[PDB]
Symmetry: C2
Subunit: 75 residues, 2 copies
Protein backbone atom coordinates (compact mmCIF):
# COMPACT_ATOMS: atom_id res chain seq x y z
CA UNK A 1 0.00 0.00 0.00
CA UNK A 2 0.92 3.74 0.15
CA UNK A 3 1.39 4.92 3.74
CA UNK A 4 0.24 8.39 2.68
CA UNK A 5 -3.06 7.28 1.08
CA UNK A 6 -3.56 5.36 4.37
CA UNK A 7 -3.39 8.52 6.49
CA UNK A 8 -5.19 10.93 4.04
CA UNK A 9 -7.97 8.48 3.62
CA UNK A 10 -8.12 8.07 7.38
CA UNK A 11 -8.50 11.76 8.15
CA UNK A 12 -11.24 11.92 5.46
CA UNK A 13 -13.26 9.17 7.24
CA UNK A 14 -12.67 10.80 10.63
CA UNK A 15 -14.01 14.18 9.60
CA UNK A 16 -16.76 12.61 7.48
CA UNK A 17 -17.67 10.73 10.64
CA UNK A 18 -17.23 13.84 12.86
CA UNK A 19 -19.61 15.59 10.46
CA UNK A 20 -22.46 13.13 11.10
CA UNK A 21 -22.01 12.50 7.45
CA UNK A 22 -22.26 9.28 5.45
CA UNK A 23 -20.38 8.23 2.25
CA UNK A 24 -23.13 8.94 -0.32
CA UNK A 25 -23.63 12.17 1.68
CA UNK A 26 -20.05 13.19 0.97
CA UNK A 27 -20.38 11.86 -2.60
CA UNK A 28 -23.26 14.26 -2.94
CA UNK A 29 -21.83 17.41 -1.36
CA UNK A 30 -18.40 16.85 -2.96
CA UNK A 31 -19.62 15.98 -6.48
CA UNK A 32 -18.12 12.50 -6.74
CA UNK A 33 -19.53 8.93 -7.02
CA UNK A 34 -20.30 6.90 -3.86
CA UNK A 35 -18.34 3.98 -5.41
CA UNK A 36 -15.34 6.33 -5.36
CA UNK A 37 -15.82 7.46 -1.76
CA UNK A 38 -16.08 3.90 -0.38
CA UNK A 39 -13.00 2.87 -2.37
CA UNK A 40 -10.91 5.80 -1.23
CA UNK A 41 -11.65 4.97 2.44
CA UNK A 42 -10.47 1.33 2.24
CA UNK A 43 -7.23 2.54 0.60
CA UNK A 44 -8.57 0.99 -2.54
CA UNK A 45 -8.69 4.10 -4.79
CA UNK A 46 -6.15 6.67 -5.93
CA UNK A 47 -7.33 10.24 -5.47
CA UNK A 48 -5.82 13.19 -7.30
CA UNK A 49 -5.28 16.64 -5.73
CA UNK A 50 -8.55 17.85 -7.35
CA UNK A 51 -10.65 15.00 -5.97
CA UNK A 52 -9.11 15.87 -2.62
CA UNK A 53 -10.18 19.50 -2.97
CA UNK A 54 -13.66 18.41 -4.19
CA UNK A 55 -13.74 16.21 -1.10
CA UNK A 56 -12.60 19.06 1.21
CA UNK A 57 -15.49 21.17 0.03
CA UNK A 58 -17.83 18.25 0.59
CA UNK A 59 -16.45 18.12 4.12
CA UNK A 60 -16.72 21.89 4.70
CA UNK A 61 -13.22 21.93 6.26
CA UNK A 62 -10.41 24.35 5.60
CA UNK A 63 -7.05 23.34 4.29
CA UNK A 64 -5.30 24.42 7.52
CA UNK A 65 -7.65 22.34 9.73
CA UNK A 66 -7.40 19.29 7.47
CA UNK A 67 -3.64 19.20 7.21
CA UNK A 68 -3.34 19.93 10.94
CA UNK A 69 -5.48 16.80 11.39
CA UNK A 70 -3.29 14.96 8.85
CA UNK A 71 0.02 15.53 10.69
CA UNK A 72 -1.72 14.42 13.94
CA UNK A 73 -2.60 11.12 12.30
CA UNK A 74 1.01 10.86 11.09
CA UNK A 75 1.92 11.22 14.73
CA UNK B 1 -6.96 24.75 -8.06
CA UNK B 2 -5.89 26.94 -5.11
CA UNK B 3 -4.66 23.73 -3.40
CA UNK B 4 -2.45 22.60 -6.30
CA UNK B 5 -1.05 26.15 -6.22
CA UNK B 6 0.15 25.87 -2.61
CA UNK B 7 1.26 22.19 -2.68
CA UNK B 8 3.20 22.83 -5.89
CA UNK B 9 4.74 25.94 -4.32
CA UNK B 10 6.02 24.19 -1.16
CA UNK B 11 7.50 21.52 -3.51
CA UNK B 12 9.55 24.12 -5.45
CA UNK B 13 10.57 25.89 -2.20
CA UNK B 14 12.06 22.79 -0.57
CA UNK B 15 13.48 21.55 -3.95
CA UNK B 16 15.21 24.97 -4.11
CA UNK B 17 16.18 24.90 -0.39
CA UNK B 18 17.64 21.48 -1.16
CA UNK B 19 20.09 22.85 -3.77
CA UNK B 20 18.08 20.59 -6.02
CA UNK B 21 17.00 21.01 -9.67
CA UNK B 22 13.90 19.49 -11.35
CA UNK B 23 15.53 16.56 -13.18
CA UNK B 24 17.40 15.99 -9.89
CA UNK B 25 14.03 15.49 -8.12
CA UNK B 26 12.65 13.57 -11.11
CA UNK B 27 15.63 11.28 -10.57
CA UNK B 28 15.56 10.84 -6.77
CA UNK B 29 11.74 10.66 -6.60
CA UNK B 30 11.65 8.37 -9.69
CA UNK B 31 9.31 10.45 -11.88
CA UNK B 32 9.70 12.13 -15.34
CA UNK B 33 11.26 15.62 -15.61
CA UNK B 34 8.29 16.55 -17.88
CA UNK B 35 5.86 16.01 -15.04
CA UNK B 36 8.02 17.74 -12.36
CA UNK B 37 8.08 20.92 -14.48
CA UNK B 38 4.33 20.52 -15.23
CA UNK B 39 3.43 20.14 -11.54
CA UNK B 40 5.36 23.29 -10.55
CA UNK B 41 3.68 25.65 -13.12
CA UNK B 42 0.43 24.39 -14.57
CA UNK B 43 0.35 22.46 -11.31
CA UNK B 44 -0.26 19.32 -13.39
CA UNK B 45 -2.45 16.78 -11.61
CA UNK B 46 -0.43 14.80 -9.08
CA UNK B 47 -2.00 11.93 -7.12
CA UNK B 48 -1.30 11.17 -3.46
CA UNK B 49 1.24 8.54 -4.54
CA UNK B 50 3.18 10.96 -6.76
CA UNK B 51 3.30 13.30 -3.75
CA UNK B 52 4.75 10.59 -1.57
CA UNK B 53 7.23 9.71 -4.37
CA UNK B 54 8.28 13.34 -4.57
CA UNK B 55 8.43 13.65 -0.73
CA UNK B 56 11.16 10.98 -0.72
CA UNK B 57 13.00 12.56 -3.64
CA UNK B 58 12.98 15.67 -1.36
CA UNK B 59 14.27 13.86 1.82
CA UNK B 60 11.57 15.64 3.94
CA UNK B 61 9.08 14.25 6.45
CA UNK B 62 5.31 14.44 6.25
CA UNK B 63 5.28 16.53 9.44
CA UNK B 64 7.75 19.15 8.13
CA UNK B 65 6.24 19.28 4.61
CA UNK B 66 2.68 19.85 5.81
CA UNK B 67 3.89 22.33 8.47
CA UNK B 68 5.45 24.15 5.50
CA UNK B 69 2.18 23.78 3.59
CA UNK B 70 -0.03 25.44 6.21
CA UNK B 71 2.53 28.29 6.42
CA UNK B 72 2.14 28.96 2.69
CA UNK B 73 -1.59 28.83 3.20
CA UNK B 74 -1.45 31.12 6.25
CA UNK B 75 0.94 33.77 4.86
CA UNK B 76 -0.91 36.78 3.42
CA UNK B 77 -1.01 40.47 2.16
Amino acid sequence: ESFLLSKVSFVIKKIRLEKGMTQEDLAYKSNLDATYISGIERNSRNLTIKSLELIMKGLEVSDVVFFEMLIKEIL
